[PDB]
């Protein structure tokens, strides 16, 4: 409902077609947190 | 962001990066043309503080 | 100043082109010089029309190359660039020259 | 995607180069004739990508059967503008520079890594003292901090093999010449 | 004997700092304690040039050179000159003169200011030049022709089709 | 004209294209009054050695459609007969019957 | 170019423009709803793909706007009202329209 842009367009198609279902994905503001921590000398990642 | 007045009240980050790039380009030019070492010490102090 | 040399075989077409160019100039910039007609080149050709022999039998063709000299006195930022996207009709060789 | 861990660590300069797609070199942001940005300042196009989707700065590619090829005029890969949210650039500092989070976080990690109090490190990093690196067979130690008259002494009597520097280059040489195995065994 | 020292001013008001410094010297009449004041020299505009006009020449990045001696009175004098931050040296008690061994090599480079130099350059058609002078300013294009005998790069401002072909000088346009 | 003739012409053209730089140079050398006699002689001999078809004064302008040597026009690259046909068809731009 | 306040506006019909006068500004006294048009305002677009008709329409009226991008002022969604007072201020040099 809030952040994930591909998630909410999938949600809007799924609501107007009657299928109550969410494809979760990732918050885009967490990627903003990764870019702000990564823009320092810090190397944050996502393992596996 | 535009403020709808013909001008851009900029965010603080672009000001900070602009200060670092000004000071760094002036330090590259002063290490280029063989400045006296007191002035490049002062310039490196300014870059570290920026 | 931007001198513009329009050259074409069809006169009407050339005229049309010239007008268009003027229009392009006049909205963006100011003080378009004007569409000055230079002399037309009437390059003539005679040929024998028989396959074999009959020398007095002849066709005399010609190609009328028309010239239009358009000049622009003040080249602004907006004006000169406007011509880049503004291509003219086919069969009209233009030739812009600043200074 | 799928992941089970968030790893945090320091970042080598090769890592910062490998994140980066270009180099920022000038401080201009916008042209303010149009709002087409200046190459290659902070807001760029050939570092960070196109402003408009599949809309090349120069404009030459806009076909559905013509995707993947990059531009030649402005050299802007006709892609999406979402990629201006993820491409990073790098600045090559002309002289090295001490990070502030490892210098003044109380405790100082550079402080209790070098076995050296924070006041000497601040007086070296701001170009108002001298620290010793590669002291040689002289009277001077390794972590001995100096001053102007003492460096005049040490360069008159020992202008040869003695060495000492100042600023972030000196701290970088101290931290690079640190041998961690010897420090583990000695402690 | 008067040795040299470096003064920091508010960068941009440097000529006014130099004038106010000369005037404070001739006010507090320590005329035997100041030799010169050196500011913004070594002009070069942008690329090359054999005519006048041009201008926009600047090398001094905000530092004022002063021939001086060191008494605390003259030190307070130079720091009481307005729009002056302070000297730049090892310490603020006894601030630092610069050198003298690098003055001999700088003297030979200053004597060769204009005698025999101005190295040649080069260019090519790609990708596109930049115009920043005349109505074509703020526009880009490509150089189809490059007359090295007339020093005129023929650039039509790199626009699709037959737009406006023109001739711009090397300084009139940027690579 | 024949095919063979056309082929020959083409060959000649090719030769001309090939040997232009050298031939021209040789000519220049021969001309140059401020030069050695022996050198000049060599140049003259050198020229002889080069193929004859290398000369541009060897190749005849033929019609680009029919290969007819005579009745040629340069502007169109066509023999009179073909040119006329083209004109009639509308295929030559700008060209129409002239009267004055 | 500059903007247009005039009522010759694309993408709209009679049902919007009945509550505006011949120069874009709503009347004094017109009781409006939430989401009508008070001031009609259109900004420049561009020719881009100047076609035969587009090029012929850019040399018949002598204006280059042409279709424009609607940016008209609207009543914010929710509020009714009655327009009681209209002020028009003009920076000097600009042509005053008929309602000013």
Overview of the structural elements:
Chain A: Belongs to the RNA polymerase beta chain family. The structure is cut from a larger assembly and holds two copies of chain A, two copies of chain B, one copy of chain C (99 residues), one copy of chain E (175 residues) and one copy of chain F (100 residues). Chain A has two helices and one strand, in the order ααβ. With 48 residues, chain A is mainly α. The radius of gyration of chain E is 23 Å and the shape is elongated. Chain E is an alpha+beta fold and 175 residues long. In chain E, strands 2-3-1-4 form a four-stranded antiparallel beta sheet, covered by helices on one side. Chain F is mainly alpha-helical and 100 residues long. In chain F, strands 1-2 form a two-stranded antiparallel sheet. The chains are: A mainly alpha (48), B mainly alpha (50), C alpha+beta (99), E alpha+beta (175), F mainly alpha (100). Chains in contact: A-D, B-D, B-E, C-E, C-F, C-G, D-E. The interface between B and D is medium-sized, with 20 and 19 residues. β1 of chain A pairs antiparallel with β1 of chain D.
- Percent helix of chain C, as a range, is 25-40%
Q: Which architecture of the domain at 1-112 in chain E does the CATH hierarchy give at level 2?
A: 2-Layer Sandwich
> CATH topology of the domain at 1-112 in chain E, what is it called?
Alpha-Beta Plaits
Beta-strand proportion of chain E: 15-25%
Alpha carbon gap, first and last residue of chain E = 50 Å
PDB class: transcription/translation
Keywords: TRANSCRIPTION-TRANSLATION complex
Entry title: Escherichia coli transcription-translation complex B (TTC-B) containing an 30 nt long mRNA spacer, NusG, and fMet-tRNAs at E-site and P-site
Chains A, G: DNA-directed RNA polymerase subunit beta
Record the SSE blueprint.
The structure is cut from a larger assembly and holds 2 copies of chain A, 2 copies of chain B, 1 copy of chain C (99 residues), 1 copy of chain E (175 residues) and 1 copy of chain F (100 residues).
Chain A: H1 5-16, H2 28-38, E1 42-44
Chain E: E1 3-9, H1 14-27, E2 34-38, E3 63-68, H2 72-80, E4 84-87, H3 103-111, E5 129-131, E6 139-141, E7 143-147, E8 152-155, E9 166-168, E10 173-174
Antiparallel strand pairs in E: 1-3, 1-4, 2-3, 5-6, 5-10, 7-8, 8-9
Chain F: H1 3-18, H2 20-31, H3 37-49, E1 72-73, E2 78-79, H4 80-89, E3 95-97
Antiparallel strand pairs in F: 1-2
Keywords:
part of a larger assembly, 7 chains, B: 50 residues, C: 99 residues, Alpha-Beta Plaits, 6-stranded antiparallel β-sheet, 41% strand, transcription/translation, TRANSCRIPTION-TRANSLATION complex, DNA-directed RNA polymerase subunit beta
